[PDB]
Nucleic acid binder design. Structure first.
Ligand SMILES: [Mg+2]
Ligand SMILES: [Mg+2]
Ligand SMILES: [Mg+2]
Ligand SMILES: [Mg+2]
Ligand SMILES: [Mg+2]
Ligand SMILES: [Mg+2]
Ligand SMILES: [Mg+2]
Ligand SMILES: [Mg+2]
Ligand SMILES: [Mg+2]
Ligand SMILES: [Mg+2]
Ligand SMILES: [Mg+2]
Ligand SMILES: [Mg+2]
Ligand SMILES: [Mg+2]
Ligand SMILES: [Mg+2]
Ligand SMILES: [Mg+2]
Ligand SMILES: [Mg+2]
Ligand SMILES: [Mg+2]
Ligand SMILES: [Mg+2]
Ligand SMILES: [Mg+2]
Ligand SMILES: [Mg+2]
Ligand SMILES: [Mg+2]
Ligand SMILES: [Mg+2]
Ligand SMILES: [Mg+2]
Ligand SMILES: [Mg+2]
Ligand SMILES: [Mg+2]
Ligand SMILES: [Mg+2]
Ligand SMILES: [Mg+2]
Ligand SMILES: [Mg+2]
Ligand SMILES: [Mg+2]
Ligand SMILES: [Mg+2]
Ligand SMILES: [Mg+2]
Ligand SMILES: [Mg+2]
Ligand SMILES: [Mg+2]
Ligand SMILES: [Mg+2]
Ligand SMILES: [Mg+2]
Ligand SMILES: [Mg+2]
Ligand SMILES: [Mg+2]
Ligand SMILES: [Mg+2]
Ligand SMILES: [Mg+2]
Ligand SMILES: [Mg+2]
Ligand SMILES: [Mg+2]
Ligand SMILES: [Mg+2]
Ligand SMILES: [Mg+2]
Ligand SMILES: [Mg+2]
Ligand SMILES: [Mg+2]
Ligand SMILES: [Mg+2]
Ligand SMILES: [Mg+2]
Ligand SMILES: [Mg+2]
Ligand SMILES: [Mg+2]
Ligand SMILES: [Mg+2]
Ligand SMILES: [Mg+2]
Ligand SMILES: [Mg+2]
Ligand SMILES: [Mg+2]
Ligand SMILES: [Mg+2]
Ligand SMILES: [Mg+2]
Ligand SMILES: [Mg+2]
Ligand SMILES: [Mg+2]
Ligand SMILES: [Mg+2]
Ligand SMILES: [Mg+2]
Ligand SMILES: [Mg+2]
Ligand SMILES: [Mg+2]
Ligand SMILES: [Mg+2]
Ligand SMILES: [Mg+2]
Ligand SMILES: [Mg+2]
Ligand SMILES: [Mg+2]
Ligand SMILES: [Mg+2]
Ligand SMILES: [Mg+2]
Ligand SMILES: [Mg+2]
Ligand SMILES: [Mg+2]
Ligand SMILES: [Mg+2]
Ligand SMILES: [Mg+2]
Ligand SMILES: [Mg+2]
Ligand SMILES: [Mg+2]
Ligand SMILES: [Mg+2]
Ligand SMILES: [Mg+2]
Ligand SMILES: [Mg+2]
Ligand SMILES: [Mg+2]
Ligand SMILES: [Mg+2]
Ligand SMILES: [Mg+2]
Ligand SMILES: [Mg+2]
Ligand SMILES: [Mg+2]
Ligand SMILES: [Mg+2]
Ligand SMILES: [Mg+2]
Ligand SMILES: [Mg+2]
Ligand SMILES: [Mg+2]
Ligand SMILES: [Mg+2]
Ligand SMILES: [Mg+2]
Ligand SMILES: [Mg+2]
Ligand SMILES: [Mg+2]
Ligand SMILES: [Mg+2]
Ligand SMILES: [Mg+2]
Ligand SMILES: [Mg+2]
Ligand SMILES: [Mg+2]
Ligand SMILES: [Mg+2]
Ligand SMILES: [Mg+2]
Ligand SMILES: [Mg+2]
Ligand SMILES: [Mg+2]
Ligand SMILES: [Mg+2]
Ligand SMILES: [Mg+2]
Ligand SMILES: [Zn+2]
Lengths: 50, 112, 63, 252, 91, 77
RNA sequence: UUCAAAUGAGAACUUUGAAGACUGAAGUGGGGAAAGGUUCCACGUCAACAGCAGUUGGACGUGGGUUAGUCGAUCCUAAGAGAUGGGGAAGCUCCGUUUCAAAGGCCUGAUUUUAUGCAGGCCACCAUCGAAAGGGAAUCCGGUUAAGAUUCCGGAACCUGGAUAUGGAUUCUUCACGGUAACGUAACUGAAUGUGGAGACGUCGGCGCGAGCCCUGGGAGGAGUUAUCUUUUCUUCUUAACAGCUUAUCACCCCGGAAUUGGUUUAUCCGGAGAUGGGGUCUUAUGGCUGGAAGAGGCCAGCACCUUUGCUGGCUCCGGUGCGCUUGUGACGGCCCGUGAAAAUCCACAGGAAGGAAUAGUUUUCAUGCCAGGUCGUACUGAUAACCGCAGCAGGUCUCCAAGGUGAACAGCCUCUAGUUGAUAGAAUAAUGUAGAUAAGGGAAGUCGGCAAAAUAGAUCCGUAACUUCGGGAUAAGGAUUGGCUCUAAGGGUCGGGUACGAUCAACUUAGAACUGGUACGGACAAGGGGAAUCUGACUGUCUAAUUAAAACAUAGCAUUGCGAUGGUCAGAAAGUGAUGUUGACGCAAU
RNA sequence: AUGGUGAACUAUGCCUGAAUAGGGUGAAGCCAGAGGAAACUCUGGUGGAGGCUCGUAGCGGUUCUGACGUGCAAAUCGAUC
């Protein structure tokens, strides 16, 4: 890093949008079943493997 | 006491990464990157730095009035003049001897 | 205050001396000075005629 | 067992020549019209060091007679040849050190180097720091010429085959003790990866015909047949005699 | 004042390699570093530069020569043999 | 980036087609050793270089400032 | 580590002030490469997480933030990789990379149906990928942000492409003059084709000079100490790219003609192939003064007021020193069976096809002028918490910058600047520990074994054996000396001398002599135990990462073998296939 | 047994880069001088040689058969080297 390829900037940027908690309004829909976000990620817990 | 950092992302000490510490109007020390040095062009005959000709890294010779890249003589910016001297002398003399070689063996054929 | 006292030949005895004589002042450095100075004297006396060339040239090679 | 060392060198991986610094390949001029009906002049613009070579190369430039332009060849410098010198290449060319002549035209006794095997293979015989060949006779009908090589082996090649007058430079190179490991180190540095050499006797059986045992010993005869198969041939291959050479050498 | 009874330039090698070997080198080293007479301009300015190559300080001529010395004994006989043989061809 | 001294060449600069604006500068300085004196630099700005003409004489400056084209944009100090 | 304040339900742990310390410029400072990917910054904020805690965080929630013609990429080529005409292979695919190939595109001319067919002449180079440390067009300084900056703001530049118009230069001797010459210059035409240079190159050594740093005098400022003493201690006093003029060791030219040989480096080279001498010519590394540019920056004092925050004055000057340190660089010298890349790219010259003036032509390598410069990366960590080791792991992980003292020193030890003060805490100090020490008399009696420990140590002088490959053995061994202070002597630079000496300036070295002390003084730090033999390996060098470092491997040296290419040796399933081979017996291969 | 994936560790070659305080020794070459009938021999300097030596960084890994041995660590830590 520190001087990256646009391919990698993307995945990096895509991964930044996926790093939010559940939108709580979803919690309210009929039959809704998703308690929490089970696909979250931390920079110092799981590495992206590029 | 005042120390200093490279100004480019390259962190290693190479020929294209030479530094030069400098005092700015700000009163601070600062690195300045220094282009590699120019070397003098040379005689393609004797081999010396050929005098009268200016010296700058090659592409910089295209940003320069034509006089900086020449001297005003036969074979000007290209051979060292004592070289030109030589190849004039040898030219004359060998062209002359050519005459002495011809008419002499023009006699051989007639006296044989 | 100290450095001054140094200037007066102080604190320079065998006791306060940890590097060798050579390291403190390289033999060669001493030489090169001396010879540069003999050399430079000759050129003076000769550049004035105080001494002639034939004598100079002997001194040079002797120096 | 493991593939033994000498087998591995053929697949040429970490073995291949160290090529990079080398003036180019040394060669005679192509065998054109000029050089086989007359002769042609050029100047040695430079004699220089080839890397991994014993003998100095010789940059020698000529005119191209079929286009206005210079064409430079690369010669191995015979002894005593010098920059600025004129060099002659051709059947009808005078016989002084440095010139290249067909072996048909040199009186016997002539000493020559970098000689062609077939004519026009641009040099191929005695090119090494010191060596040369001696023309020991001619046979006009079926124009052959007989020469002695540096090996002492006598050979007969065609007379049109060229070779150059004189001996190769760098004489006596092998006379100086290498002296230490580093010198050979730097010797082979610019040749190929063949040094240092472990002894097959110091390895285990997996590694070599000689390997293993509770003492270091070849354990069977080290003179190995010609017909011997890959992975067997290590030691004195095809050895017809063996032991310290008593008495004079020199091919009778 | 004489510094070494015998080892000469070979005195760099200290105690190593064995006397005999130092001798063989020394002989050849004295040959290679030595300064030589120029056939062309006549000053003793020919000095070596990598095995085989001999070049004049001034006048800048370069001769190809022996590995450690300028003229191989061999080569020089060869110079003469060719002399001889050449001569026959004109006369 | 360029210095000028010809007080005729100067004038013509200030009438060049591309020379839009210019500025006049005033430093107190000192003379030889004894005393001070008022210096004045006449900077003209071309499309690719700032020519500046130092006039060390107070008198010459007062007359020069009037020679300036009235269509020129002068920045005083 | 400590005291206090503030904050908060709550404070050993957060913020702030104070105190004590630490890292000590080979950093716990300032930045980067790889790797991470938002951790960067702000606000909110503690359920989990940070092996005590928590009001704090690299955690949680929510947002904000990475600006380029000039920095990189992009282009170039390196080892190598790899399509294609081919040839192998049942086939996936293997070979080959210019090789058994009909391999392709530039300049302007021919058009004035017209847009671009043919007319010359070339040129045979025949993919492409491969470097964010190699090659390479061009930018700096000041200011600015919560967080960006050689990227924004401000000022000043430069490069490349494209357009071109005025000025100048040039020509009736058409394609300039000048200089004896080296060569000068604001210019001063030049197709094909050829040729030359630059790109472009090892390492060590001393010596010369540059820059930054270090040291230091005077003056102008601000600060510190002042029982006492000190014209004191500390600190500010700066000048970018770019441009003009000027500046060089080297090299070369002109004059002249050398034994009584001279010139000359620290280092012994130079000259009748023209020295010493005199006079000139060039390279512009580097430096000087001016432009930039004092308006900036830096230091102060003197007025204003919730504010944005101003407003007004000043000063920013002159020098010294050198085996200093770091780096840059030149002229040289040593070394080699080692002689220490390539291409893109830029210029020059040889050539002279051609085009071009007097009623007006040629000229854009002189000046000035106009338009344009895309795409992607730009945050931050770089480590005793941002990377890899299951982790905020005593491990690992490529590099630049570098102050004062002591000392030989980039050592150790103390300090300035900057940064830390993180590592659960409290009370006691039993046994046994781990780590650090001392011990009367004896001195290895301990033990497999002096294991461990002790002893030694710097520097100056004196003194030094067998043996030896004559180079060593050697710091052999053995000795003496060493502080403080006070003096003496030796060692240098710069100037004017008709064609003997005078005058001043600035240095630590080295030897000596007094006095002095609870006989101490390399006073901490730092720093070799020696000796006589046997065995074994010659030596330096190498290995079992994680129980073996050795006498084992290597080595030079010695010797033996194979081979002249239709070949030795070795690779492959094959082959119009491959290593040795850019090779040739002073060689390659095999012991 | 068949078919696949690895040289981010490590082994070795190539290509292109980068890195190493201060000391001791004093090899060729060079200058001046001394003796000697001669042949030749000596002294003082200068100079800076080496897979040389003292020793940091670096690289390594000898001993304590030291620490640790449910570790900081699936190889580390200390001193010594
Ligand atoms: Mg940066
Ligand atoms: Mg280097
Ligand atoms: Mg680069
Ligand atoms: Mg010129
Ligand atoms: Mg010039
Ligand atoms: Mg000396
Ligand atoms: Mg002097
Ligand atoms: Mg002399
Ligand atoms: Mg190859
Ligand atoms: Mg090897
Ligand atoms: Mg071996
Ligand atoms: Mg062997
Ligand atoms: Mg074994
Ligand atoms: Mg077997
Ligand atoms: Mg067998
Ligand atoms: Mg065996
Ligand atoms: Mg045996
Ligand atoms: Mg605490
Ligand atoms: Mg606090
Ligand atoms: Mg401290
Ligand atoms: Mg240190
Ligand atoms: Mg820390
Ligand atoms: Mg990270
Ligand atoms: Mg975020
Ligand atoms: Mg933060
Ligand atoms: Mg809680
Ligand atoms: Mg955590
Ligand atoms: Mg906790
Ligand atoms: Mg808790
Ligand atoms: Mg967040
Ligand atoms: Mg650039
Ligand atoms: Mg691009
Ligand atoms: Mg292929
Ligand atoms: Mg490419
Ligand atoms: Mg690059
Ligand atoms: Mg800034
Ligand atoms: Mg912003
Ligand atoms: Mg920043
Ligand atoms: Mg701007
Ligand atoms: Mg502007
Ligand atoms: Mg342009
Ligand atoms: Mg003119
Ligand atoms: Mg070319
Ligand atoms: Mg070239
Ligand atoms: Mg290079
Ligand atoms: Mg200061
Ligand atoms: Mg610049
Ligand atoms: Mg002169
Ligand atoms: Mg003159
Ligand atoms: Mg000196
Ligand atoms: Mg450095
Ligand atoms: Mg060389
Ligand atoms: Mg050029
Ligand atoms: Mg122009
Ligand atoms: Mg385009
Ligand atoms: Mg940044
Ligand atoms: Mg950073
Ligand atoms: Mg951190
Ligand atoms: Mg991690
Ligand atoms: Mg993981
Ligand atoms: Mg860790
Ligand atoms: Mg930090
Ligand atoms: Mg702990
Ligand atoms: Mg406790
Ligand atoms: Mg006791
Ligand atoms: Mg006793
Ligand atoms: Mg006893
Ligand atoms: Mg006992
Ligand atoms: Mg025992
Ligand atoms: Mg016993
Ligand atoms: Mg012990
Ligand atoms: Mg004791
Ligand atoms: Mg012995
Ligand atoms: Mg002994
Ligand atoms: Mg005393
Ligand atoms: Mg005195
Ligand atoms: Mg005096
Ligand atoms: Mg050994
Ligand atoms: Mg092991
Ligand atoms: Mg194992
Ligand atoms: Mg060992
Ligand atoms: Mg071990
Ligand atoms: Mg033997
Ligand atoms: Mg076939
Ligand atoms: Mg690797
Ligand atoms: Mg060193
Ligand atoms: Mg020492
Ligand atoms: Mg050393
Ligand atoms: Mg006498
Ligand atoms: Mg040395
Ligand atoms: Mg060594
Ligand atoms: Mg050692
Ligand atoms: Mg030491
Ligand atoms: Mg270590
Ligand atoms: Mg090692
Ligand atoms: Mg250990
Ligand atoms: Mg243990
Ligand atoms: Mg335990
Ligand atoms: Mg050590
Ligand atoms: Zn010569």
């Amino acid at each position: 890093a520190a001087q990256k390829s646009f391919r990698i900037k993307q995945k990096m940027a895509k991964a930044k949008k996926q790093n939010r908690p559940l939108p709580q309004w979803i919690r309210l829909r009929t039959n809704n079943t998703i308690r929490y976000n089970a696909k979250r990620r931390n920079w110092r817990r799981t590495k992206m493997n590029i | 006491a005042q120390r200093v950092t490279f100004r480019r992302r390259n962190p290693y000490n190479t020929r294209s990464n030479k530094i030069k510490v400098v005092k700015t109007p700000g009163g601070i020390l600062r690195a300045q990157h220094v282009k590699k040095l120019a070397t003098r062009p040379k005689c393609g005959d004797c081999g010396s730095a050929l005098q009268g000709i200016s010296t700058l890294r090659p592409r910089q010779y295209a940003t320069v009035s034509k006089t900086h890249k020449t001297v005003s003589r036969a074979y000007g910016g290209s051979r060292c003049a004592n070289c030109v001297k030589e190849r004039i002398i040898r030219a004359f003399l060998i062209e002359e001897q050519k005459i002495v070689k011809k008419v002499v063996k023009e006699q051989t054929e007639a006296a044989k | 205050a100290h450095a001054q006292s140094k200037r007066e030949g102080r604190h320079s005895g065998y006791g306060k001396r940890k590097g060798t004589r050579e390291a403190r002042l390289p033999s060669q450095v001493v030489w090169i000075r001396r010879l540069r100075v003999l050399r430079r004297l000759l050129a003076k006396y000769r550049d004035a005629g105080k001494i002639d060339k034939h004598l100079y040239h002997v001194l040079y090679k002797e120096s | 067992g493991r593939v033994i060392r000498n087998q591995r060198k053929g697949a040429g991986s970490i073995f291949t020549s160290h090529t990079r610094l080398r003036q180019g390949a040394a060669k005679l001029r192509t065998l054109d019209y000029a050089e086989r009906h007359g002769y042609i002049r050029g100047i040695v613009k430079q004699i220089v060091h080839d890397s991994g070579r014993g003998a100095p190369l010789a940059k020698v430039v000529f005119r191209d007679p079929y286009k206005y332009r210079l064409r430079e060849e690369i010669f191995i410098a015979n002894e005593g040849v010098h920059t600025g010198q004129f060099i002659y290449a051709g059947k009808k060319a005078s016989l002084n050190v440095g010139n290249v002549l067909p072996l048909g035209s040199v009186p016997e006794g002539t000493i020559v180097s970098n000689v062609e095997e077939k004519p026009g293979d641009r040099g191929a015989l005695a090119r090494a720091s010191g060596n040369y060949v001696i023309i020991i006779g001619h046979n006009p009908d079926e124009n052959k010429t007989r020469v002695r090589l540096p090996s002492g082996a006598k050979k007969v090649i065609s007379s049109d085959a060229r070779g150059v007058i004189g001996v190769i430079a760098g004489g006596g190179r092998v006379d100086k003790p290498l002296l230490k490991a580093g010198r050979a180190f730097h010797k082979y540095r610019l040749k190929r990866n063949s040094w240092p050499k472990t002894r097959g006797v110091a390895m285990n059986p997996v590694d070599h015909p000689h390997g293993g045992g509770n003492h270091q010993h070849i354990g069977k005869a080290s003179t190995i047949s010609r017909g011997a198969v890959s992975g067997q041939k290590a030691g004195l291959i095809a050895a017809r005699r063996t032991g310290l050479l008593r008495g004079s050498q020199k091919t009778q | 004042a004489k510094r070494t009874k015998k080892v000469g330039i070979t005195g760099k090698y200290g105690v190593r390699y064995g006397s005999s070997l130092r001798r063989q080198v020394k002989k050849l080293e004295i040959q290679q570093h030595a300064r030589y007479d120029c056939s062309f301009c006549g000053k003793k300015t020919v000095k070596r530069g990598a095995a085989g190559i001999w070049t004049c300080s001034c006048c800048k001529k370069t001769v190809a020569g022996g590995a450690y010395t300028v003229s191989t004994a061999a080569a020089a006989t060869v110079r003469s043999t060719i002399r001889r043989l050449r001569e026959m061809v004109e006369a | 980036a360029r210095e000028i001294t010809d007080i005729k060449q100067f004038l013509e600069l200030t009438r060049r087609a591309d020379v839009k604006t210019a500025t006049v500068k005033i430093n107190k300085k000192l003379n030889k050793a004894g005393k001070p004196f008022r210096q004045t630099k006449f900077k003209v700005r071309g499309s690719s270089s700032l020519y500046t003409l130092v006039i060390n004489d107070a008198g010459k400056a007062k007359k020069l400032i009037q020679s300036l084209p009235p269509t020129l944009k002068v920045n005083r100090l």
